[PDB]
Design a protein around this nucleic acid. Structure first.
Lengths: 112, 143, 117, 102, 55
RNA sequence: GACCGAUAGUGAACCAGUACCGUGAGGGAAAGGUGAAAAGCACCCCGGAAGGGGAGUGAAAGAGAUCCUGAAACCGUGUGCCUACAAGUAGUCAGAGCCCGUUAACGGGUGAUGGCGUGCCUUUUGUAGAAUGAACCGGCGAGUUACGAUCCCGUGCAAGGUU
RNA sequence: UAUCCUUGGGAGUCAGACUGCGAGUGAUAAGAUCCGUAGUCGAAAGGGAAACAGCCCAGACCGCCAGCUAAGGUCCCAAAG
RNA sequence: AACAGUGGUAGGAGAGCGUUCUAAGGGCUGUGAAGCCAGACCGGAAGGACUGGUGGAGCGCUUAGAAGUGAGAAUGCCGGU
């Protein structure tokens, strides 16, 4: 059926993650994971991490096959937004947003 | 009722006819051609879905403006480049490129947005001999 | 004796956004701009009900006039000749019968010419 | 058969064996009405000129009264603030022809 | 000159898309069963004109 | 109590004259909800962790510790239709293809052509503006109450009404 | 009588704006200045004038794929000799 | 029945609708009330109401009287974005 995990509250922009997110969709798990592991990008090991736990959970806990999985679909949405002031010049202040976002992934079997 | 006999989008005419512009006054010829291109000729719907008649001229020769304005009706357009306003007189337009003063003279008499200029392009004209068509065996006609 | 708020206001609002539905994602997701679209759509409707009815005249006659010409006759003397032949216009609308049966329109065109000879 | 009938102040084209949207001139539910105000029979014959053909008389089986859906009417007057709304419902009747008696 | 409109989804998307992130030009190296870096030292068998380092 | 229900009712429902601000008296905020019962997840696995993922709990776990019902703006994912030769406050009217489908009118979905359409208030003679105001959505919010005066109109009495 | 008249209860408006007709100023530069009359716009659509508030046709309380018509046209766009 | 109709800003005049509340005659709801979203849903001129889904404990038709009684506008107001 499906292989599943989710990460909640993860410092990474929706915009930033969105790029990498679409690029792993429909892709063979075995290929996607390997790629991500060594890259100069920092969102790569994070989206990877969650993806690997989806595999992990699927096997160990409710029984699935990890040799049949691909990446069904995935998406990324902003979670809460925590505004913080950063003293901006001219007597002002700006609101930097240290984002905490919900990276969602639905792995699944499709080669079973 | 609330509707009436009308054209469908599967209604295709698109007949090809020989016509000449040689010895023709123009605006007598071009106007009546424009009518048929617009879909008016059919007993069925004129603008919503329509097919006109594509017409190919073989011989395009002398046009009559019946005065001194045959050789002195100066045409104009304003096209992007720093030279702007380019002008070409009737006398020299008749000598070379008489195609394009009969082409824009049936576009000027047609309304229509997108589709109208598409069907229009299938109309051709030439001063020598033009009709490679033989698939539809173009029927002779003169207005 | 204090008004409900919420729900009541959202009932009144829903009407506007429903009439303005199907447009964009800025023309009915935004209330104040949705308002503007409803004004247009309603006005358009009412004027065009009368505009369309006059346009049908300016449509059938265009078709007829061309067909008539392919039987050696012009619209002006067609219409006249029909009234001369029986005291019937027979509807310009219903002369759409030149599509359905060509034969009818042909003989009725000759019948028009008859009293004009 | 090609025929034409009077429906009050207008006329409608009518064949035979087909329903038609008509004005209510009284024609409710399952009844039978006729059009002796018929004025064309042919489509291969002519009956113009001849207002009212007496060689024919259409028979119709009344097939329900329907009602046209509401359609927005509105007056906005910009800079004057008017907001008069209406929706035009109005009933109408439907009949089905199936035999044009001679 | 500064924004005069809120900016619809259509405009914003036309801008931010037509281009998208792509994976590096990694090749699949069947001599270690994982991706390597094309014409660069592999991260699991050292492939780039000799193979001898599996780190 | 013909008082109000988390923007209402006192500045302040709640660990508020607190937080926060100026040298200073002083100015002066926001903030309700897991269950009926805590039984707030025994037991296990992966995530360095942050979290989840099975299982169990219980009526309910889309009640699982940041949670009542939780809209809308806002932002992603899947799907039907549609666009790479064109001219627009985006619809309206009318045809037309494709897809779908109504309990009933027998019906919805879309946009390929043709005609037509220049936001609202502010302010008027005229703003569609190159005049005034608005980032957007939601909720919130301005013709009042009392006592005289003058009319209204409903009734009881009416040469009587009234403490 | 979709007239006046009388009484009681609520008004709103005070550059109107624009055009024609008629009298006066410049014996008639000036979005120059005044009135008698009517019209329209104001406040009220649409038709014709390319569109072009106020000229000209005319007044929108609602659907009809019915017809006649005004100003204004009939070679095409812009229905139609 | 016949007969005529002018429905336009400022305003005048006539009826209704929803919202909260108190009242006396009545009635629904855990097998699903209030609130929430979709329906090619029906009935309105308009202001105005039905079924499925979610949700998980209260709700209301008539007859009357009362109001904090219906927002697209003053770099209006508060939260979200």
């Amino acid at each position: 059926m499906q292989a599943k995990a989710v990460a909640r509250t993860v410092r990474i922009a929706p915009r930033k993650a969105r790029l990498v997110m679409d690029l792993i969709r429909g892709k063979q798990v075995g290929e996607a994971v390997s790629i991500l592991n060594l890259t100069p990008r920092a969102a790569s090991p994070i989206i990877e991490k969650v993806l690997k736990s989806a595999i992990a959970n699927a096997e160990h806990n409710y029984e699935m096959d990890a040799n049949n999985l691909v990446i069904s679909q995935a998406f990324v949405d902003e979670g809460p937004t925590l505004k913080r002031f950063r003293p901006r010049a001219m007597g002002r202040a700006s609101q930097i947003n240290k984002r905490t976002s919900h990276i969602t992934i639905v792995v699944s079997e499709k080669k079973e | 009722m609330r509707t009436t006999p009308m054209a469908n989008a599967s209604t295709i005419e698109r007949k090809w006819l020989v016509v000449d512009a040689a010895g023709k006054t123009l605006g007598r010829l071009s106007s009546e051609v424009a009518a048929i291109l617009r879909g008016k000729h059919k007993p069925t719907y004129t603008p919503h879905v329509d097919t006109g008649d594509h017409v190919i001229i073989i011989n395009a020769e002398k046009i009559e403006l019946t005065g001194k304005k045959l050789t002195d009706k100066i045409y104009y357009r304003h096209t992007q480049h720093p030279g702007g306003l380019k002008s070409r007189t009737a006398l020299e337009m008749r000598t070379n490129y008489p195609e394009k003063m009969l082409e824009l003279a049936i576009k000027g008499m047609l309304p229509k947005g997108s589709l109208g200029r598409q069907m229009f392009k299938k109309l051709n004209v030439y001063r020598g001999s033009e009709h490679p068509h033989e698939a539809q065996k173009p029927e002779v006609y003169e207005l | 004796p204090r008004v409900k708020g919420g729900t009541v206001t959202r009932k009144r609002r829903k009407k506007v956004l429903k009439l303005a539905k199907g447009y964009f994602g800025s023309k009915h997701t935004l209330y104040k701009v949705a308002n503007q679209q409803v004004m247009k759509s309603g006005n358009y409707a009412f004027r065009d009900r009368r505009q369309k009815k006059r346009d049908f005249r300016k449509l059938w006659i265009t078709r007829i006039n061309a067909a008539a010409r392919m039987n050696g006759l012009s619209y002006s003397r067609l219409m006249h000749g029909l009234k001369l032949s029986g005291i019937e216009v027979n509807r310009k609308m219903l002369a759409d019968l030149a599509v359905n049966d060509l034969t009818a329109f042909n003989q009725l065109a000759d019948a028009a010419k008859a009293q004009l000879n | 058969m090609y025929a034409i009938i009077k429906t009050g102040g207008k006329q409608i084209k009518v064949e035979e064996g087909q329903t038609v949207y008509i004005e209510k001139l009284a024609a409710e539910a399952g009844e039978t009405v006729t059009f002796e105000d018929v004025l064309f029979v042919g489509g291969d014959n002519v009956k113009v000129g001849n207002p009212t053909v007496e060689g024919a008389t259409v028979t119709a089986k009344v097939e329900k009264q329907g009602r046209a859906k509401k359609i927005t009417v509105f007056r906005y007057k910009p800079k004057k603030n008017v907001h008069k709304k209406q929706g035009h419902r109005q009933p109408y009747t439907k009949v089905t022809i199936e035999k044009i008696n001679a | 000159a500064v924004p005069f409109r809120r900016t619809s989804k259509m405009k914003k998307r036309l801008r931010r898309t037509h281009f998208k992130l792509n994976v590096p030009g990694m090749t699949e190296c069947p001599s270690c069963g994982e991706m390597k870096l094309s014409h660069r030292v592999c991260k699991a068998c050292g492939s780039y004109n000799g193979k001898d380092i599996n780190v």
